[PDB]
Amino acid sequence: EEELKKLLEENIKLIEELLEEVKHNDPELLLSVLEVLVRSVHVIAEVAREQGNEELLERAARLAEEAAYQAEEVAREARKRGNLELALKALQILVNAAYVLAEIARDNEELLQKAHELAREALRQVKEILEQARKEGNLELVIIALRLHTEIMRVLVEIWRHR
Amino acid sequence: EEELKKLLEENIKLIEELLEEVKHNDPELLLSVLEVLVRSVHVIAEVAREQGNEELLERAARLAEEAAYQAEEVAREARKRGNLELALKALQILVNAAYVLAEIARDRGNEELLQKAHELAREALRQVKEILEQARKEGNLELVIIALRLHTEIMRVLVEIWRH
Amino acid sequence: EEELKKLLEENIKLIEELLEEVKHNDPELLLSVLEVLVRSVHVIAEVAEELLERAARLAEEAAYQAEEVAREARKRGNLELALKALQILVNAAYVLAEIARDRGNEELLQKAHELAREALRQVKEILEQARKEGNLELVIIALRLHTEIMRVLVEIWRHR
Numbered sequence: 001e002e003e004l005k006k007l008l009e010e011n012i013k014l015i016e017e018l019l020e021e022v023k024h025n026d027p028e029l030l031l032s033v034l035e036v037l038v039r040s041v042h043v044i045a046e047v048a049r050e051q052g053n054e055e056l057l058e059r060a061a062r063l064a065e066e067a068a069y070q071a072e073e074v075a076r077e078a079r080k081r082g083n084l085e086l087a088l089k090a091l092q093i094l095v096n097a098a099y100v101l102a103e104i105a106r107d108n109e110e111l112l113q114k115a116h117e118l119a120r121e122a123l124r125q126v127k128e129i130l131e132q133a134r135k136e137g138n139l140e141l142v143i144i145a146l147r148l149h150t151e152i153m154r155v156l157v158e159i160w161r162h163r
Numbered sequence: 164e165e166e167l168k169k170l171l172e173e174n175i176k177l178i179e180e181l182l183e184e185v186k187h188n189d190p191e192l193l194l195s196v197l198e199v200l201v202r203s204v205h206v207i208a209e210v211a212r213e214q215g216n217e218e219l220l221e222r223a224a225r226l227a228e229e230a231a232y233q234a235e236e237v238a239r240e241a242r243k244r245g246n247l248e249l250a251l252k253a254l255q256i257l258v259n260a261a262y263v264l265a266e267i268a269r270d271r272g273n274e275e276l277l278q279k280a281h282e283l284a285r286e287a288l289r290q291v292k293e294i295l296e297q298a299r300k301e302g303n304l305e306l307v308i309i310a311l312r313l314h315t316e317i318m319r320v321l322v323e324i325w326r327h
Numbered sequence: 328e329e330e331l332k333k334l335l336e337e338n339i340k341l342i343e344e345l346l347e348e349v350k351h352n353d354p355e356l357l358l359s360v361l362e363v364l365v366r367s368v369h370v371i372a373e374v375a376e377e378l379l380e381r382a383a384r385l386a387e388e389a390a391y392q393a394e395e396v397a398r399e400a401r402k403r404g405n406l407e408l409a410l411k412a413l414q415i416l417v418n419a420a421y422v423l424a425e426i427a428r429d430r431g432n433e434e435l436l437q438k439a440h441e442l443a444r445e446a447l448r449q450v451k452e453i454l455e456q457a458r459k460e461g462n463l464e465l466v467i468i469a470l471r472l473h474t475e476i477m478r479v480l481v482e483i484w485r486h487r
């Protein structure tokens with residue numbers, strides 16, 4: 001009756017194999033795998049609240065935690081290389097990983113706090129890109145940064161709602 | 164019989180007339196209108212469950228079913244013509260049409276509709292699986308991303324079917 | 328435990344300062360920030376207040392700017408920016424209706440309804456025009472918009 005149980009394991013396995021395969025590839029391609037990963041992790045959380053499966057939550061929490069650091073590494077290197085566009089994309093996947101991590105926390109304060117620092121770090125990083133973008137005079141890039149700035153803020157209010 | 168009821172009928176008339184017009188034109192435009200069809204059906208299902216218009220459930224479910232089969236034919240032809248992107252794009256509207264069909268099935272209690280949506284997901288899973296091995300063979304890592312993105316979305320449909 | 332209040336004020340302050348500066352710049356750029364502006368007002372859902380009235384006012388001002396760009400776009404003959412501008416109008420109407428139900432402002436609910444009702448009127452005109460002009464691609468964009476006003480208008484009915 002549980003055909004999705006095979007499909008659930010099949011999906012993460014294909015993503016994890018791709019993630020290791022794409023690790024050496026272009027950062028933009030790496031961000032694409034992380035985008036699908038955090039999109040996948042949300043449904044593994046959605047299919048563990050329906051289940052009594054607490055073990056599946058630990059799996060999704062580890063993958064969301066690992067996806068968070070991967071987005072952070074690409075964000076640090078991209079900003080160092082001068083690419084604010086690819087960098088700003090990385091914080092987007094970073095906060096998205098933090099958002100699902102906060103959802104994973106509900107039904108462990110340490111996971112909620114861990115997701116909080118992930119969101120807090122993202123807000124700190126985008127602030128540097130936003131303030132820098134205003135200095136460079138690129139109003140178009142400030143929109144993307146301000147668009148992101150709202151998204152971390154929108155996520156950050158949810159942690160308060162989670163208490 | 165409110166004022167929104169007129170807007171619902173007005174929307175389906177414009178969608179149905181366009182769908183027949185673009186069938187002979189290009190699949191990409193046909194996919195765009197088909198995408199709105201499942202988007203429109205989702206909002207019409209939410210107001211027929213709220214207004215208790217059980218007749219509208221059959222109408223909205225039929226349109227999602229028709230959008231599913233229309234998405235499937237263009238998905239089948241696209242893979243035959245070698246356009247895996249348009250095929251993978253078409254499968255997205257298919258699973259979304261299957262998703263709303265599964266959601267209507269669980270609410271209305273139509274066990275036949277739940278399996279029909281289930282087979283739609285099974286068909287979509289077969290195509291992406293075939294596309295995935297093909298995309299991996301040609302070395303197009305970009306296409307496996309779209310396929311894995313689609314593959315993940317199929318799981319969301321299977322989660323809802325089990326919830327019934 | 329009100330650490331977000333600084334970030335909340337920082338978001339509205341950064342958006343409002345940018346919104347006033349870019350208004351005279353490019354219409355496409357003005358529409359994009361208005362999308363972020365209407366996205367920013369959504370954070371007002373957290374009702375702790377005095378800041379709620381400020382953010383609700385900002386949504387009112389963002390609504391008219393999208394309509395003004397929509398009017399000029401149709402006047403300039405570019406239906407594309409109009410449908411894009413009309414799109415941001417409907418989200419502004421959507422967020423305005425949600426804020427109305429929080430404080431129970433029945434006048435705001437009818438006001439937000441009229442923006443969507445008018446937005447459906449313009450998009451209906453563009454749709455018949457786009458089909459008449461033969462730009463089948465624009466009819467999809469117009470029909471794409473048409474669904475969203477219906478989704479917002481259906482939600483407004485769910486309130487009353």
